[PDB]
Design a protein around this ligand. Structure first.
Ligand SMILES: C[C@@](CCn1ccc(-c2ccccc2)cc1=O)(C(=O)NO)S(C)(=O)=O
Ligand SMILES: [Zn+2]
Length: 299
């Protein structure tokens, strides 16, 4: 059978919140079967735990934020994308502050942490959610769609309307597996445009962001000395974000996601739209791993 997995060892990292600019200590720990990914605010008394589930997404302004009462865990998407990419079903994520550290702006440092801690297979069937029929959401010039597919395909289209793109809409599609996640997605960094600084300043956002942990674009060009990791790094990051936001469903999806200028808000609305359409999806397990729809790394 296709099994659930967790981490084999505890591992630690330090960084800063992209939006808060606050130093934060992170600890990843193994967790039991059927736990999912759970964030724990160990700086609070009492300690507050927030499951990383779509229903706990309370804010989606330039990040995905989990909320339980007055307690928040911000910017969960890049970590969650790495957990999804490596097939980590269950884990605890302890934080000393309200925001996951941004690291280098990509999921690469989280792939490092997960692979260095190692994986532990658990004796429980992995439950997948399979898309049976098309579901979509649309807010203005943004749209997000699920359609059936036997695997997990993440497609994205976005026109950034900036000179670095040479007037070309950015498009990419990834046939998801742990290997294609590592190869094609994991290292794509977050990004910002200087045209948006007044907006960010006014909302006290991106306080921890710079060329050290993000691609920064001025009126003409990418400011980062070494340029881009991928020619299509911007759209590949949008795919990284979608993988992390979609993992908040609580189960790996068997289907195709198509994003059209979509972001965190619409990603969460698509999950709520899908969940509510009870006949558009089903829960499945695999007794015979030879029919597995998605290839995950072995522990
Ligand atoms: C929502 C974004 C983007 C987050 N994000 C990153 C970087 C900056 C920034 C950094 C330095 C200078 C100016 C802006 C601002 C910001 O808001 C995402 O990556 N969320 O995970 S996105 C790429 O989808 O727009
Ligand atoms: Zn992102």
């Amino acid at each position: 059978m296709i099994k659930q997995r967790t981490l084999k060892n505890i591992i630690r990292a330090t960084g800063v919140g992209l939006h808060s600019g606050e130093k934060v200590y992170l600890t990843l720990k193994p967790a039991p079967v059927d736990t999912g990914i759970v964030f724990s605010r160990t700086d609070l008394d009492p300690v507050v735990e927030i499951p990383a589930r779509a229903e706990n997404v309370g804010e989606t302004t330039m990040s995905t934020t989990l909320v339980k009462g007055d307690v928040k865990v911000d910017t969960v998407e890049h970590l969650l994308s790495a957990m999804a990419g490596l097939g980590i079903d269950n884990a605890y994520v302890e934080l000393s502050a309200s925001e996951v550290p941004i690291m280098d702006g990509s999921a690469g440092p989280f792939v490092f942490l997960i692979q260095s801690a190692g994986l532990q297979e658990q004796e429980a069937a992995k439950k997948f959610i399979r898309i049976k029929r098309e579901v979509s959401v649309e807010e203005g010039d943004k749209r997000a769609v699920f359609v059936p597919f036997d695997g997990f395909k993440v497609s994205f289209e976005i026109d950034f309307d900036h000179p670095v793109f040479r007037g070309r809409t950015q498009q990419a599609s990834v046939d998801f597996s742990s290997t294609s996640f590592v190869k094609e997605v994991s290292r794509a960094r977050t990004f910002g445009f200087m045209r948006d600084i007044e907006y960010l300043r006014s909302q006290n956002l991106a306080l921890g962001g710079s060329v050290e942990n993000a691609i920064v674009v001025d009126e003409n060009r990418v400011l980062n000395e070494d340029g881009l990791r991928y020619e299509d790094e911007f759209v590949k990051h949008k795919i990284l974000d979608a993988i992390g936001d979609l993992y908040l469903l609580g189960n790996s999806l068997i289907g195709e996601f198509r994003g059209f200028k979509s972001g965190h808000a619409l990603n969460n609305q698509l999950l709520r739209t899908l969940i509510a359409d009870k006949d558009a999806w089903e829960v499945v397990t695999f007794e015979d791993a030879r029919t597995a729809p998605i290839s995950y790394m072995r522990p």
